[PDB]
Amino acid sequence: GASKLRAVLEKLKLSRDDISTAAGMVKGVVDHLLLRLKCDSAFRGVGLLNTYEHVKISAPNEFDVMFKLEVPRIQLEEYSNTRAYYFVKFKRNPKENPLSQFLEGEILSASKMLSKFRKIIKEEINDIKDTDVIMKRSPAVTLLISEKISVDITLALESKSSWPASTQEGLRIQNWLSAKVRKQLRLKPFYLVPKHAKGFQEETWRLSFSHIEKEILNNHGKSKTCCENKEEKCCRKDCLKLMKYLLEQLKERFKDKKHLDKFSSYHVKTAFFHVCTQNPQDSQWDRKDLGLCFDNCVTYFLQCLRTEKLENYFIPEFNLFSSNLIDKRSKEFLTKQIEYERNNEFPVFDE
């Protein structure tokens, strides 16, 4: 029942200290690069984005880090009705921006900016000889510290402006976290990561709302006091940790023929939060009900792959499971693998 799952989560608690020692290795290298970039003309307004504060975790030895660049008076042009991919233009010309180095008429190049960013890092990488830091061959700068810790660095354009139109019906937390909280969150800035649409269109930026996850996860209840006492203990966080570790273990047992390469913890998060919308009450996430609650996430995720539909939590018109992003075969393969786990009381957790 719920007994087996608790031991898995209690096991995952034991590796917190090993992740904490490796976390300081990430922040050390990252702070040197931030000092190096600030001395440059274009990367003077570079800062660390808090998404472990500024260090986000995707896999056990993978660490996603985000560098933000303040872009004032930014005008966005939507690309090919994709709803998430956009072009970066400038409202007017009051006093020429320092970002003009990568401009191409009106449109700001994503390929040109990421290239100078890759160059300034490649130069600073060989400088700090304290730890073995390298660079790998994908809109991120991957580093490898002590031939084990992989750090995916991403550059993002910050816009303090009102969120784009495609996000109008997104973040459907009204019946869960409230209309008050939705309005509050939508007052926060948004990000433009250089993810390119399928060759590629290397001048299009993707809408990123990564920074909102910590806001919702650290305040996940309908009741303001959720998980603040022994009475209101819920299992929302435990179901997300079990959903993340499920895909993680399936990506480990099937690196045999590389079918699940397109799948990330991101797809698992999106699906979990959609269940959080479906189940807005705290009584639908009780600590005793861990087994039942996890199965609700497992059923929704299986229904997602099966229907080839998983809406971006912020952009409903954007389908993360479209034929264009992940092929029909990879979804039908993952459907079959999870279906086997669900029908056999999850044998990929027995360790």
Tell me if 152 is assigned to a ligand binding site: yes
Q: Nearest approach, Cβ of 11 to ligand YQL (angstroms)? A: 24
Q: Which is nearer to ligand YQL, 266 or 333 (CB)?
A: 266
Q: Quick one: which of 305, 309, 298 has its CA closest to 329?
A: 305
- Residue 24: which residues within 8 A CB-CB, separation 6 or more? none
Distance CA(287)–CA(104), nearest Å, equals 55
Tell me if 293 is assigned to a ligand binding site: no
Footprint on this chain of ligand YQL (rule: CB under 6 A): 64, 208-210, 212-213, 216, 264, 266, 269-270, 273, 313-314
Q: Nearest approach, Cβ of 36 to ligand YQL (angstroms)? A: 23
Tell me if 208 is assigned to a ligand binding site: yes
Q: Nearest approach, Cβ of 59 to ligand YQL (angstroms)? A: 12
Tell me if 213 is assigned to a ligand binding site: yes
Q: Which is nearer to ligand YQL, 5 or 84 (CB)?
A: 84
Tell me if 211 is assigned to a ligand binding site: yes
Q: Which is nearer to Zn ion, 234 or 302 (CB)?
A: 234
Tell me if 31 is assigned to a ligand binding site: no
Q: Nearest approach, Cβ of 280 to ligand YQL (angstroms)? A: 14
Q: Nearest approach, Cβ of 41 to ligand YQL (angstroms)? A: 27
Q: Which is nearer to ligand YQL, 270 or 337 (CB)?
A: 270
Name the token pair of 134.
């390298």
Q: List binding-site positions for ATP.
A: 62-64, 210-213, 244, 265-269
Q: List binding-site positions for 2',3'-cGAMP.
A: 64, 152, 195, 206
